[PDB]
Design a protein around this ligand. Structure first.
Ligand code: MG
Ligand code: MG
Ligand code: MG
Ligand code: MG
Ligand code: MG
Ligand code: MG
Ligand code: MG
Ligand code: MG
Ligand code: MG
Ligand code: MG
Ligand code: MG
Ligand code: MG
Ligand code: MG
Ligand code: MG
Lengths: 167, 143, 258, 164, 99
RNA sequence: GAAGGGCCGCGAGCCCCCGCGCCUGGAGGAAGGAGAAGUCGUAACAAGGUAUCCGUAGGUGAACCUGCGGAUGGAUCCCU
RNA sequence: CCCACAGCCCCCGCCGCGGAGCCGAGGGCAAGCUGGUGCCAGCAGCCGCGGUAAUUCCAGCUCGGCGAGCGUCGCGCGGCGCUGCUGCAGUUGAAACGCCCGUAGUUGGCCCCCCGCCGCCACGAGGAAACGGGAGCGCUCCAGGCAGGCCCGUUGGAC
RNA sequence: CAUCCGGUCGAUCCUGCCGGAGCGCGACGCUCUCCCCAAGGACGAAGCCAUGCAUGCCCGCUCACCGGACGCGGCGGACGGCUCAGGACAACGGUUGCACCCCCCGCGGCGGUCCUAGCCGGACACCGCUGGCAACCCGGCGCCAAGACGUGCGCGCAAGGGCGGGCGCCCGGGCGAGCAGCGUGACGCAGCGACGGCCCGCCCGGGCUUCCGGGGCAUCACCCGGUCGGCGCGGUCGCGGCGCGCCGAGGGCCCGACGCCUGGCGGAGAAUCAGGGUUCGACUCCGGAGAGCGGGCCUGCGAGACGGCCCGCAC
């Protein structure tokens, strides 16, 4: 089936190497999970029997995740609203597909329920008084079956704000 | 001198010999491949064929004789050759449309003696050696 | 490529220092995984059948072992292919024979008979220190044994004395210049000498220079240098004291024995 | 595979490069008559062994006297030659070996030793007697004519006790 | 980069000369060595091309001498990283330089 | 949670076209070699009866002939 | 006796099958006498024989070589300094480009007393045996095998 | 263990080839007393296959017949054996590495589990009754066991994720190397447990990877366009153009690229014999690849397995 063996490629000179054996099971790959944001329907996670009896779980649908505000040391479980930016391609954004590095909007309730009363960074607080907070994804859905991340801070926040503001 | 002799000149010497060793007739005949594709026996000690015509061939100018030979067709090639049965009075033992085994002469693929354009020898007919039939060790009453 | 692990062993592919006859058969015993590896071990049956000669076949050895007639480090072993290695204790109570497995100068395994006073322990080489679960310090050895909570004063390549009955450390010998050692690998297996120099190369092997009692000097890598005490051996050693004779003297000895 | 595949084997003799040589034929026939040899394979065997010894001696002689390998190999070779009686005892230098010759090999055959002991009338008689198993070496019956006797067994060769 | 990045140097250290420097952060290194032929009792000069990653901390032009350290596979043809550069002077004649 | 269906992925087999390599028929045309004691002339070897040969160009039943320039492996080591 | 059962080898008793072929005899290349045939039949790796003595064909006698093996066919090494690194040839035998410039390539005078680097030499570590070499041992010898002796280097299988 | 001989002429010396003389591998032919060792459908048919055999064992579970049957369950069947089609910077040989990895048995340790425990629940197999079909194959009803399946008694514990070192450099758990482990803020309740094994280390094995070596033809001189590199995600045991999107333009070549051919498995080694070398290497040991051609997959630590299953094609 799908394989990642290098025998089917060309050489550094651009030559055809040739083939000397049939396909092997060590060098196989699998179809992508394509984890979807929920926005019969519910959280669905599958399990994969990998080499050595090891277990791998890929998420197909999920709606929640753990997010951390590093500067203030605040962490809660929050609901993810939608994906708003992705560097690889805009098609993933349109489909609300979750991958590592996606930029998402989370609900503000778990944070505002305790914030807006202590001196901290102005920008995060302005986000808090609203409905959503900009954030990022740091885990790998499709390998561990989870979608965690962290709240954006300084220069990267400015970068992404300037990116998505005109839209 | 005429030949290169520097300490870092192995490549040139190898290439020179590689190119120049193709000028020997023997080396070409052995390592070129044309002879193998042209030899009806394809590098075999001897072959098996069917005799189809019994003929006599004159000798060369300084000699005077008619040598006895037969025309053969090889089973595994379907091509034609001329093979010569030397021993005295051994033509009468060979009959038309008979199974024969044909080998070579002393020289690899050149003509031998005053026989013109003949390079093969008959050794077995109908499964019995001709040398044995000539000495009366056995008889061909099966044919 | 074989689809899995290997279970057989051709006789011609067996280690040389086992001394197996070419015409004995197509096959040789395949040792099972255990305290020692394939190339630093010798199967039990070879000792019990081709040396001591208490058995003449595989079957007799099987009966003897399954009747519990040999103890290895205080534990009965019923496997004819169990691997025996260096500085192991071989006791047969039925005949009151006790042996310690060591190396001869020629580079082969030998059985040195011992006493009762020194058969309650063994020497082990520590070559790996690591943190296990919960950050608990650990320590491993050449015979595939691990000990938790070792003394901080014990470092790598040191030598450790452990009671056979209880795997508890008593005293330890450091790897240092001036300590008697015994070579356990390579061209110099079975030689005994004292460390004279230590030279390290960043990212490569560390070479140890040793001098024999007679003044001969030899080199070997640190991976097969075993400490056996502080200037004097801690255990009984073969009749010869780790001296390899030259071919001439060996020939003289052979002629004398002829 | 069968264990019989690992059994070794080799030839033991060499044929001359030029066969039809009159002096060689004369000398070979002369030697065959003198020692009553069966065929000419025995002479070829003797020449083979002599060549082996000579080559070993050459290789050792090329080296220095104080070479450990030279001492070891020369000592072994001299001991073998002395034990076999081919070389005289009083010679203990590697140079003397190169002067050896096949006749010295022949003189140590069983036929020869029993003939010089006056135990047989002739080499042919010796061979006939050996075949019939009327002879013994050290109390053991030997029926191989080409059997070579060591010096220590020279006085131990006698007639078989059980022979008629 | 081996200094500010997340790779480790392990294995063999080698030396060579710069042959090309056209890619964004990669170069081609030329290595020269000798091969002996027993029949003719003489040598041949051989060379090989080895690609390496060049970090922005180094400035390199053709003919420079570099020291490369072995790393994990970084791409299809790259397993080495530059760790030292020694400049070479202007218009210096190309010379056979085993290292 | 079965049968069944849809979209993608791995990918057989057949059809169409292109290219490469190895063999092979063919009226007629043309080369070479061997065989014999065929017909027409004598080009070369002697100054071989016009000294021989090289390159180039044209012509003629055939060997060959002629023109321009060159060599002696020539038939000359020798003349204000 | 041996053998899983049986052969075989070996040992003990009574009777006792003693059998040599394949090539060649002009030279290379060791080895010659009558009868036929008559450039026919045939031999002959090459030179050659045979057109009335055929020292060469076909037969008999005799003789030689190897020998339980001998001869024929094909291939590889050698022969071959006829592929030439050691170690060919290049006026006339086969073979110096019509001449010059010139990049890759190959090759480059003499000089510094010691430092660094490359090659080089020596030693060493590390890494399977079998094969090959080789120490010791009377499978009756031998091709072999790693045995074996009693009062054995710790018997040995070194390197 | 450094050898030559016959043949161009009316005679002679040379060049130069033809032929002879030796060893080995096979086939053909004649012949053959005794003993010992010993190869044996490989040689452009990896062509086709009647017939028989080549993988079983057993601790647990007996109201079976008189405990032996049978069946469930466990281990093994991925080793061994055959062949050399394919594959020419590959395989393979020597030398590195994983601070980019996985691993059954075995040996030694370790063993704390968030929110009826004098012992839990329901089934199937064999078997009884009733039956289909030429064969191969199975159907329905019915009481019963487990070291089988499910649930699960218990001192907080799997994967993953955020934060936690410096001020030119160097001078313990561990390294040559900031690598391991731990704390703490949030997520999630994975595995073990109705006769206690999840986990760690070693070992054998595997996967990839550095450097050097690795056939011929120039009547093949220019070749490559995921081809070369960078950024990001995905997938994988895992690194990686391995795959996808975007960006740039590169990489190889007379020190012979690319293409074509091979009656091409490689090495340890074999034949030959002054020294230097030439030719071969199906076959005993190691390694690779395949099981009519081409593909796909389940079980399992481990197979893209074929004396395992699914499809197309040829039989
Ligand atoms: Mg004229
Ligand atoms: Mg004229
Ligand atoms: Mg003239
Ligand atoms: Mg010549
Ligand atoms: Mg001329
Ligand atoms: Mg000429
Ligand atoms: Mg609980
Ligand atoms: Mg249970
Ligand atoms: Mg092939
Ligand atoms: Mg194999
Ligand atoms: Mg397979
Ligand atoms: Mg398959
Ligand atoms: Mg089958
Ligand atoms: Mg199988």
């Amino acid at each position: 089936g799908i394989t990642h063996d290098k025998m089917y490629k060309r050489s550094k000179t651009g030559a055809v190497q040739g083939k000397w054996h049939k396909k092997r099971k060590y060098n196989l790959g699998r179809q992508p999970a394509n984890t979807k944001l929920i926005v019969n329907e519910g959280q669905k996670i599958s399990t994969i029997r990998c080499r050595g009896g090891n277990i791998k779980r890929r998420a197909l649908r999920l709606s929640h995740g753990s997010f951390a505000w590093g500067s203030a040391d605040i962490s809660h479980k929050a609901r993810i609203l939608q994906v708003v930016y992705n560097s690889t391609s805009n098609e993933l954004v349109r489909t609300n597909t979750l991958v590592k590095g996606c930029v998402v909007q989370i609900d503000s309730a778990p944070f505002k329920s305790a914030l807006s009363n202590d001196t901290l960074d102005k920008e995060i607080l302005d986000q808090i008084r609203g409905d959503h907070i900009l954030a990022r994804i740091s885990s790998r859905p499709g390998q561990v079956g989870t979608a965690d991340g962290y709240i954006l801070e300084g220069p990267e926040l400015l970068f992404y704000q300037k990116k998505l503001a005109p839209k | 001198m005429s030949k290169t002799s520097g300490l870092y000149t192995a490549r040139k010497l190898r290439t020179v010999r590689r190119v120049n060793r193709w000028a020997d007739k023997k080396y070409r005949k052995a390592h070129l491949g044309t002879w193998l594709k042209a030899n009806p026996l394809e590098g075999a000690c001897m072959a098996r064929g069917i005799v189809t015509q019994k003929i006599g061939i004159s000798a060369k100018q300084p000699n005077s004789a008619v040598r006895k030979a037969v025309r053969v067709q090889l089973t595994k090639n379907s091509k034609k050759i001329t093979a010569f049965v030397p021993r005295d009075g051994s033509i009468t033992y060979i009959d038309n449309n008979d199974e024969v085994l044909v080998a070579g002469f002393g020289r690899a693929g050149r003509a031998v003696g005053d026989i013109p354009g003949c390079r093969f020898k008959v050794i077995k007919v109908a499964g019995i050696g001709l040398l044995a039939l000539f000495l009366r060790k056995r008889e061909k009453r099966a044919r | 490529m074989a689809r899995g692990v290997r279970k057989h062993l051709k006789r011609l592919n067996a280690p040389k220092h086992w001394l197996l006859d070419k015409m004995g058969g197509i096959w040789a015993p395949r040792p099972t995984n255990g305290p020692h590896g394939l190339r630093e071990c010798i199967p039990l049956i070879l000792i019990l059948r081709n040396r001591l000669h208490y058995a003449n076949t595989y079957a007799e050895t099987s009966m003897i072992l399954q009747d519990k007639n040999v103890l290895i480090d205080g534990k009965p072993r019923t496997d004819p292919t169990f691997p025996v290695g260096f500085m192991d204790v071989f006791e047969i109570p039925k005949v009151h024979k006790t042996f310690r497995v060591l190396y001869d100068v020629k580079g082969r395994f030998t059985l040195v008979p011992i006493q009762s006073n020194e058969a309650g322990f063994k020497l082990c080489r520590v070559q790996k220190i690591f943190l296990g679960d919960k950050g608990m310090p650990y320590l491993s050895t050449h015979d595939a044994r691990t000990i938790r909570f070792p003394h901080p004063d014990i470092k790598t390549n040191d030598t450790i004395k452990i009671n056979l009955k209880t795997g508890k450390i008593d005293e330890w010998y450091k790897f240092d210049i001036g300590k008697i050692v015994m070579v356990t690998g390579g061209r110099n297996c079975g030689r005994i000498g004292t460390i004279q120099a230590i030279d390290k190369h960043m990212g490569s092997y560390t070479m140890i220079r040793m001098k024999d009692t007679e003044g001969t000097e030899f080199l070997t890598r640190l991976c097969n240098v075993f400490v056996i005490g502080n200037d004097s051996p801690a255990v009984a050693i073969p009749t010869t004291k780790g001296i390899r004779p030259d071919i001439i003297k060996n020939r003289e000895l052979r002629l004398r024995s002829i | 595979p069968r264990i019989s595949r690992h059994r070794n084997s080799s030839k033991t003799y060499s044929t001359p490069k030029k066969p039809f040589t009159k002096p060689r034929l004369d000398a070979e026939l002369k030697l065959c008559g003198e020692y009553g040899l069966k065929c000419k394979r025995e002479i070829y065997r003797a020449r083979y062994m002599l060549a082996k010894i000579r080559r070993t001696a050459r290789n050792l002689l090329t080296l220095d006297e104080n070479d450990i390998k030279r001492r070891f190999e020369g000592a072994a070779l001299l001991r073998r030659l002395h034990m076999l009686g081919i070389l005289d005892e009083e010679k203990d230098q590697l140079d003397y070996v190169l002067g050896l010759r096949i006749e010295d090999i022949f003189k140590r055959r069983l036929q020869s030793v029993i003939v010089e002991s006056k135990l047989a009338k002739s080499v042919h008689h010796a061979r006939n007697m050996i075949k019939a198993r009327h002879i013994s070496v050290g109390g053991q019956i030997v029926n191989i004519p080409s059997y070579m006797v060591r010096i220590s067994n020279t006085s131990r060769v006698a007639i078989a006790d059980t022979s008629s | 980069c081996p200094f500010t990045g997340n790779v480790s140097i392990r294995g063999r250290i080698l030396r060579g000369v710069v042959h090309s420097a056209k890619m964004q952060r990669s170069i081609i290194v030329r290595r020269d060595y000798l091969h002996f032929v027993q029949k003719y009792k003489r040598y041949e000069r051989r060379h090989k091309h080895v690609a390496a990653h060049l970090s922005p901390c180094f400035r390199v032009k053709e003919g420079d001498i570099v020291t490369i350290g072995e790393c994990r596979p970084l791409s299809k043809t790259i397993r080495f990283n530059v760790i030292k550069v020694e400049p070479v002077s202007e218009a210096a004649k190309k010379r056979f330089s085993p290292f």
